[PDB]
Amino acid sequence: STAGKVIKCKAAVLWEEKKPFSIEEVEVAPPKAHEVRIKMVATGICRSDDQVVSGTLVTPLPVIAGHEAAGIVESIGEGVTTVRPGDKVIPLFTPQCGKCRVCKHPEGNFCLKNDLSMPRGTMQDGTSRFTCRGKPIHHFLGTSTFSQYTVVDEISVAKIDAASPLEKVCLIGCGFSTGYGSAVKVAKVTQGSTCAVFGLGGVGLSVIMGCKAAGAARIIGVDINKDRFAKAKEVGATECVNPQDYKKPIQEVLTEMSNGGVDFSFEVIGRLDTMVTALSCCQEAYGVSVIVGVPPDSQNLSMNPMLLLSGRTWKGAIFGGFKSKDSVPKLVADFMAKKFALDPLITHVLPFEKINEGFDLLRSGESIRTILTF
Amino acid sequence: STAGKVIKCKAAVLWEEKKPFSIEEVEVAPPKAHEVRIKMVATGICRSDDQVVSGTLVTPLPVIAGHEAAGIVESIGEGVTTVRPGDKVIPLFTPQCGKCRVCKHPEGNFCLKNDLSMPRGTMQDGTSRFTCRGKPIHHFLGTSTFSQYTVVDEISVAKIDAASPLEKVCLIGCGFSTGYGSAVKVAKVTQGSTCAVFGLGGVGLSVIMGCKAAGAARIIGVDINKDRFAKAKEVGATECVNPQDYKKPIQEVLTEMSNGGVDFSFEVIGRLDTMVTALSCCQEAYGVSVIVGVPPDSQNLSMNPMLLLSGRTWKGAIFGGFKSKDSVPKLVADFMAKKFALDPLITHVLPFEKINEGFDLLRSGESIRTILTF
Ligand SMILES: NC(=O)c1ccc[n+]([C@@H]2O[C@H](COP(=O)([O-])OP(=O)(O)OC[C@H]3O[C@@H](n4cnc5c(N)ncnc54)[C@H](O)[C@@H]3O)[C@@H](O)[C@H]2O)c1
Ligand SMILES: NC(=O)c1ccc[n+]([C@@H]2O[C@H](COP(=O)([O-])OP(=O)(O)OC[C@H]3O[C@@H](n4cnc5c(N)ncnc54)[C@H](O)[C@@H]3O)[C@@H](O)[C@H]2O)c1
Ligand SMILES: OCc1ccc(F)cc1F
Ligand SMILES: OCc1ccc(F)cc1F
Ligand SMILES: [Zn+2]
Ligand SMILES: [Zn+2]
Ligand SMILES: [Zn+2]
Ligand SMILES: [Zn+2]
């Protein structure tokens, strides 16, 4: 008895940059044509959400943030054919319209309907389904998961296994898939190679899982927080180094360790300097470096193009290069088949009402992934 | 008769930056172990040699430049097994030692014995085989082809078909292979794709040849000199554009023409601004951009890493990605079998004695490639 009606529910609203989320009542409009309204079951706290609070990732405010989640369909608008009420689903922060040139390309995944390149913070139709204190609130990446209910366009949701544990597979909505895919699909890590992963938070650990699954012989974790090394080795790092321990630049250390440069490097932090360092540490003639971290808004890096002329390949990707709607159900199935592990990424599980505390664990460095439960 | 003795011959010596070459007598020492002394037959004037004169490409002076050439073995040092006196050969400015990690890698070609990354201007043993006015003269990229005779390490020379027309196949020693391989081996241009090529000199025309060979549907030539357009279309460009004709930046023009960005772009000029423009004009999610041009010494470019994070691939390569000693003889065999044409690249021919006039033709923009005959 909620279908077709406005739902009044709790959501975490970000009214302004550099302020705590405000947990309060919002109104969620019913889904229009080709839209899906979801009751949220679990959502992760991803560094990108903090970057929105920090102002380094720009998107229109006020906003309902959150993009890594899973829930259950409450209702569908007219014309929806891929999910039904009661289905378990994961919102897709990168859509898959299936009709654009990128969707049709065998390698591309950054669908042209995304709200990332030039964020509008609305539904595909340019409007919002959220109201709070009488004011319209923006959506974020077409997902907006920090709410007991959200509405998403059909191209931004995927149906998953009805038996999946939503408090774990929400990670397939961002963190896990991004890291894993950056290794196995974007870099295409090869058996017996040497990999270096800069940044050992939730996404970096997933890159390590991918490098191990691809059969890398050496996976060097790189982080300035040594507290992260233990878990990195658990999931597959063979060695870990802290740049702060050395008197010489880390790229020099890594080139020496790998007898001339690594086969694959990954920047999984979001800093301009580590992107160049990661590039440099890969072997100059055949090395490949993948940018995964989201850089600060509007800032350019500076680099010497001879680093590329010698033969290096540099690339970046969103969401591990996975075509989202095709891939997410498959990843959940693979998870149910024990093909990979999600527990090592989860360090804290908190009620949704503790979202601010969850963000504090992330900022302090205490957590890898905190999952919020509704 | 000359075996084991010093040979006195004419060479084009560059005593100082920004000055004409001095054609005068030099002394060329006999080859030491694993060295090969070559009587030169033809050499091309490549933009890189002019960059040495300009000082934008740094290597120790005074020097005998020249690196795109063919000739006939005059004598071999002790232990040489891959060429013999009388064989036709092409010197390799990127060596192939066959032993280092890069030589052993299936994709790499920038052998660690190269004299390009940290140029010393000598033979592999750290010394010079050239004397002029009683002073030692530096080698260039282990080739030094602007001389009637040169001495090269065995790893920097390839034996070619004894019936090869040396005044045409010298281009396989640089210009043609670099461009053609940049398209077919490095970028891996696909059938039906859209390519954009920045710079329509000798190497850019070779990239067009490779794109056409690979089956590209559209090949867009980009150059500020419209006099280059006719020849570009002759070798396969479908359209040519001069950035100076437009009010908007050329990456916007190319993105418009290609309905969202090109599949493959190539920077074949050597400017920092065009490397970034070329990267930008490839499609944001799956585009590939290859840097072929040689940038000014020690200068960094500035770019926004979001260009990569969306999915673009950026890479560069030396000599078309070709393992040099393995590939050169195969490229010559293919030329002899009419698999590709070299004549369209050659616009002028002069005797070696007119090398300065040859450089004037390149600098004025009149020539594509001038071949010098000894
Ligand atoms: N490309 C995408 O689709 C995508 C998806 C998810 C996340 N991201 C980006 O990935 C990055 C990683 O996200 P996360 O959730 O793992 O973040 P996180 O904060 O959990 O991990 C960051 C890690 O980097 C380390 N670090 C910080 N500064 C460092 C330095 N100078 N040198 C070495 N290590 C350093 C930190 O100690 C921490 O362990 C963020 O920028 C995030 O926005 C991108
Ligand atoms: N990677 C390698 O192994 C390798 C090998 C050979 C040459 N190179 C480099 O390749 C580059 C091209 O060599 P080339 O012999 O073809 O040179 P070239 O001078 O014959 O051609 C350069 C072309 O660029 C055009 N151009 C100049 N400025 C431009 C601008 N702003 N926009 C568009 N077009 C512009 C010129 O008009 C000209 O046609 C040089 O930098 C050279 O050193 C690299
Ligand atoms: O973590 C989700 C995410 C991924 C890429 C990006 F550029 C912004 C963003 F929010
Ligand atoms: O044209 C030969 C050549 C190729 C690449 C480079 F970096 C320098 C150089 F001289
Ligand atoms: Zn699409
Ligand atoms: Zn995320
Ligand atoms: Zn080698
Ligand atoms: Zn050259």
Two structure tokens written together for B39: 């009587």
Contacts of A69 (CB under 8 A, 6+ apart): A40, A41, A42, A43, A44, A90, A91, A143, A145, A170, A173
Residue numbers in A near B109 (CB within 8 A): 285, 311
- Reference A292, options A209, A179, A190, A177; nearest CA is A179
Residue A353: DSSP 8-state: G
Query: Can you tell me whether residue B332 is helix, strand or coil?
Result: helix
The residues, ordered by sequence, that sit 6+ positions from A191 with a Cβ below 8 Å of its Cβ are: A214, A215, A216, A217
Check residue A261 and report its DSSP letter.
-
The residues, ordered by sequence, that sit 6+ positions from A150 with a Cβ below 8 Å of its Cβ are: A28, A37, A38, A40, A64, A71, A91, A129, A139, A143, A144
In which domain, by residue range, is B1 found? 1-178+318-374
Strand partners, B38: B73, B150
* Ligand 2: residue whose CA is nearest its atom 8: B293
| Sequential DSSP letters for A71-114 | EEEEEE-TT--S--TT-EEEE-SS---SSSHHHHSSS----TT-
Residues B216 and B288 in one domain: yes
Q: What is the DSSP letter of A352?
A: G
Q: At a CB cut-off of 8 Å and minimum separation 6, what does B256 contact?
A: none
- The phi, psi pair for B328, rounded to 5°, reads -55, -50
Query: Does residue A184 share a domain with residue A68?
Result: no
> Cα B314–B179–B83 angle (5° rounding)?
120
Buried b (16+ CB within 10 A) or exposed e, A85-113: eebbbbbbbbbbbeebebbebeebbbbbb
CA angle B180, B183, B187 (to 5 degrees): 150
Which letter does DSSP use for residue A14 in this model?
B
The strand pair at B313-316 and A313-316 is best described as antiparallel
How far apart (Å, rounded) are the C-alpha atoms in residues A345 and A367?
9
The whole-angstrom separation of Cα B267 and Cα B291 is 5
Write the single-letter amino acid at B245.
D
Among B287, B317, B347, where does a domain finish? B317
Residue B245 CB partners (closer than 8 Å, separation 6+): none
Contact B240, B223 (CB under 8 A): yes
**Encoding tokens for residue A300?**
């350019």
Resolution in A: 1.8
**Are A341 and A359 contained in the same domain?**
yes
Alpha helices (runs of H) in chain B, residue ranges in sequence order: 47-54, 101-104, 166-169, 175-181, 202-213, 229-234, 250-257, 272-281, 306-309, 324-336, 355-363
Pocket lining: A294 vs ligand 3, CB cutoff 6 Å:
yes
Contacts of A300 in chain B (CB under 8 A): 302-305
Nearest alpha-carbon partner for A323 in A67, A95, A83: A95
Pocket test for ligand 3, best of A43, A93, A362 (most atoms within 8 A of CB): A93
Residue A241's SS3 state is strand
- The DSSP secondary structure of A187-229, one letter per residue, reads I-PPTT-EEEEE--SHHHHHHHHHHHHTT-SEEEEE-S-GGGH
Distance A302 CA to ligand 2 centre (A): 23
Domain count, chain A: 2
Give the DSSP H/E element, type plus range, for residue B349: strand B346-351
| CA dist., res. B94 & res. B142, Å (int) | 8
Closest CA to A370 of A340, A351, A352, A347: A347
Provide the pairing of β-strand A369-373 with B7-14. unpaired
Note whether A96 and A48 are same-domain residues.
Answer: yes
Q: State how far the Cα of A268 lies from the Cα of A36, in Å rounded to an integer.
A: 32
Q: Mark whether B31 and B141 lie in a shared domain.
A: yes
Q: Which helix (H) or strand (E) element contains residue A330?
A: helix A324-336
Residues A159 and A26 in one domain: yes
CATH number at residue B372: 3.90.180.10
Eight-state DSSP code of residue A321: G
Q: Which domain-ending residue is among B317, B337, B363?
A: B317
Give distance in angstroms: CA of A48 to centre of ligand 3.
Answer: 6
> Are A346 and A367 within 8 A, CB to CB?
no
Q: How many helices (H) and strands (E) does chain A have?
A: 11, 18
Does the CB atom of residue B109 touch ligand 4 within 6 A? Answer: no
Paired tokens of B146: 């602007």
Shared domain for A265 and A335, answered yes or no, is no
Residues A164 and A79 in one domain: yes
Residues A190, A326 share a domain: no
Determined by: X-ray
